[PDB]
Structure 1
């Protein structure tokens, strides 16, 4: 990542305001709703038939919280994402078989979620910093694929 210090502060300031539990559920739910093909990984999650079914599904909510939890940790090691995400990268590839493009889709969904939540506070330049961040995480997560 190429985060100027002022980009790193802006990311950090906003992230302080986020409810990871809530944003987590929102981002994952929205992903399964906007790009329904992504549902392929969650057939044991139950009913994902409609938006309400997805957004309110206790399993989607719980998973979302887990994913954003792992992501928040990533934010504290912005210096070593590849390091931070290595075992997770290995897992997604070797066990889960999750195409890395999924990580970019979720990144974009997340940016929309932050925009949704923060309104005007999500300024053009704050968005640019988050764009760098979600790309770094996606990259980090795809680094161990082979």
Structure 2
């Protein structure tokens, strides 16, 4: 579970993201498409070309959800319920792919927050993404 320390860490690092969340969301996707091409099978309907607006559009949505989980760090299961439902019932993304995105999100943050991406923060952000992923996957079976 996430500790007070963890919560402070996450709010802090995410705090810094501010208004760039959108762009950092799009970048994490691109990174994921490039490094783990198998993830592409879920977006056959998307234009995955560099600077794709669909990707831009999608990065923003993902970012908003993360931003929402941070705002509700003490009630994520509830704050994310709807999204947990969508993923379990419609999208049905195989669970293994959450860890890939998580990973690309962490690289993206690292690449943008050198001052904040400390060992302690890194660990907190990793536990956090892991928790989001678990919520999103909780209603799979």
Residue 111 of structure 1: aligned partner: 106
State how far apart, in whole Å, the 2-side matches of 1:136 and 1:86 are.
Answer: 13
Assess if the C-alpha contact under 8 Å between 1:82 and 1:143 holds in 2: no
How much does 1:97 deviate? Answer: 1.7
The answer to whether the 8 A contact 2:9-2:121 is kept is yes
- Stretches of 4+ aligned residues off by more than 3 angstroms: none
Structure 2 counterpart SS, 1:79 = coil
- TM-score (norm. length: structure 2): 0.91
Shift of the alpha carbon at 1:79? 1.5
> Is residue 133 of structure 1 aligned with residue 128 of structure 2?
yes
Give the alignment of 1:40-51 within 5 angstroms.
40-46=41-47, 48=48
Show CA shifts across 1:69-91 (max 9, x none). Answer: 11110111112222222221111
CA RMSD for the aligned pairs? 1.3
| 1:123 to 2:118 alignment | yes
The SS at the match of 2:24 is helix
- 1:32 equivalent in structure 2: 33
List runs of 5+ in structure 2 lacking aligned partners.
none
Task: Give the TM-score of the pair, scaled to structure 1.
Answer: 0.89
Contact 2:88/2:136 (CA < 8 Å) preserved in 1?
no
Moved more, 23-32 or 76-85: 76-85
Per-residue deviation, 1:44: 1.2
In the alignment, the residues of structure 2 paired with residue 94 and residue 8 of structure 1 have an alpha-carbon distance, to the nearest angstrom, of 30
Question: Secondary structure of the residue that 2:32 maps to in structure 1?
Answer: helix
